[PDB]
Amino acid sequence: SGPVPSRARVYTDVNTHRPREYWDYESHVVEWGNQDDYQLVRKLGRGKYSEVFEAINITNNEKVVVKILKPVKKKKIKREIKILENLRGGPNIITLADIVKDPVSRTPALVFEHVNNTDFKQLYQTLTDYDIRFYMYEILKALDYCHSMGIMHRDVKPHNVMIDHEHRKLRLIDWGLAEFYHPGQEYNVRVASRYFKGPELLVDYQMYDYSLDMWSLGCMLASMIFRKEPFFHGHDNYDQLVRIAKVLGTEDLYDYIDKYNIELDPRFNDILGRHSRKRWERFVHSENQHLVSPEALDFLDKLLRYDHQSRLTAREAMEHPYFYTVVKDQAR
Numbered sequence: 001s002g003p004v005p006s007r008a009r010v011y012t013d014v015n016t017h018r019p020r021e022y023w024d025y026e027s028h029v030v031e032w033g034n035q036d037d038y039q040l041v042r043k044l045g046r047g048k049y050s051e052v053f054e055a056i057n058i059t060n061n062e063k064v065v066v067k068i069l070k071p072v073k074k075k076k077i078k079r080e081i082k083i084l085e086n087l088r089g090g091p092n093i094i095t096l097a098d099i100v101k102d103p104v105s106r107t108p109a110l111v112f113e114h115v116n117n118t119d120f121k122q123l124y125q126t127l128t129d130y131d132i133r134f135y136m137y138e139i140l141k142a143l144d145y146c147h148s149m150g151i152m153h154r155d156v157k158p159h160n161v162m163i164d165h166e167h168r169k170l171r172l173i174d175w176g177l178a179e180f181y182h183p184g185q186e187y188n189v190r191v192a193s194r195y196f197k198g199p200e201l202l203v204d205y206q207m208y209d210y211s212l213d214m215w216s217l218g219c220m221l222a223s224m225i226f227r228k229e230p231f232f233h234g235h236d237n238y239d240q241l242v243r244i245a246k247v248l249g250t251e252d253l254y255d256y257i258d259k260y261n262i263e264l265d266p267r268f269n270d271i272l273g274r275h276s277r278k279r280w281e282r283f284v285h286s287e288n289q290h291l292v293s294p295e296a297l298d299f300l301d302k303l304l305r306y307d308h309q310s311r312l313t314a315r316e317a318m319e320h321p322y323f324y325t326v327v328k329d330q331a332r
């Protein structure tokens with residue numbers, strides 16, 4: 001007997017009710033702009049999948065960001081484009097402005113709205129309790145939206161959160177790993193950065209859903225309030241689950257494994273050991289106590305659960321007491 005199937009608790013059938021063109025990205029036809037509308041100004045960074053530039057649209061003098069893609073399978077470019085187009089205009093989702101073909105490498109380039117990013121070295125030095133609650137709530141808006149639109153981001157981490165702090169403006173970026181959720185579909189578990197991988201990825205449980213993003217969000221929250229980056233600091237994918245188990249305990253892990261009849265890689269036998277579930281107080285000290293509260297710890301505990309089905313949804317997270325003062329402030 002194999003693993004027990006699983007279904008998302010919410011937004012389970014949203015893609016089923018769509019025309020197939022919404023989610024059948026392999027059949028998407030790309031609408032191309034004119035690369036001659038743009039001039040590159042300077043390089044902002046480079047990754048395994050792209051090089052990123054600041055640019056100017058010389059037809060309207062607008063600043064934009066240009067992501068020149070490295071060679072990748074055409075269906076993965078179509079996937080990112082289709083998801084960006086489907087989510088465009090949603091709260092705190094980066095806006096795809098144009099798609100052009102780089103004359104040099106003949107590769108596609110995505111053109112995004114510019115965000116005046118805040119120097120985060122200063123941001124983290126003066127970060128307040130209220131700042132963290134406010135921006136977490138802004139991220140939850142983007143996640144509830146994309147989940148409600150049938151999409152898992154699958155790469156939630158601080159690097160993919162742009163913040164213009166002067167204007168309290170936040171954007172969730174890099175949708176190149178995002179996928180459409182379909183009930184019963186088995187997904188690739190080699191997604192997300194190591195430190196933010198959910199337990200379902202680490203034990204190779206492929207029938208996962210939106211709740212994967214909620215684990216990653218809990219990892220980000222823990223690093224913020226405890227000022228410990230990364231929070232779960234594994235040496236490799238195997239050790240990453242050991243680091244989680246030393247905090248969440250091994251009992252709930254084996255309860256999770258048994259519930260879904262997951263066949264655990266035999267490497268884990270001699271490294272997981274036996275660990276109690278720790279109390280969050282052991283990460284609190286004089287340098288982070290101003291960011292930690294009973295509300296923050298209650299919220300954090302309800303995100304970081306082995307069982308993906310028992311994690312808060314994005315909308316449930318937004319209703320947590322941790323956000324009460326943010327919610328009433330936004331009512332104005």
Ligand SMILES: O=C(CCC(=O)NCCc1ccc(Cl)c(Cl)c1)NCCCCn1cnc2c(Br)c(Br)c(Br)c(Br)c21
Pocket residue numbers: 044045052065067094112113114115116117120127131132133134135136139157158159160161162163173174220224
């Ligand atoms: O520096 C970062 C962000 C690092 C960071 O700590 N965040 C804030 C994290 C955070 C999250 C939650 C909370 Cl609660 C709080 Cl408090 C803080 N990531 C590098 C991006 C590399 C350059 N890069 C790539 N793609 C880009 C796009 Br697309 C645009 Br548009 C723009 Br602009 C740029 Br620059 C782009």
Ligand SMILES: NCCc1ccc(Cl)c(Cl)c1
Pocket residue numbers: 035036037038039040055066068100101102103109
């Ligand atoms: N049109 C020449 C400048 C240029 C080169 C490459 C790209 Cl991808 C862009 Cl948008 C603009």
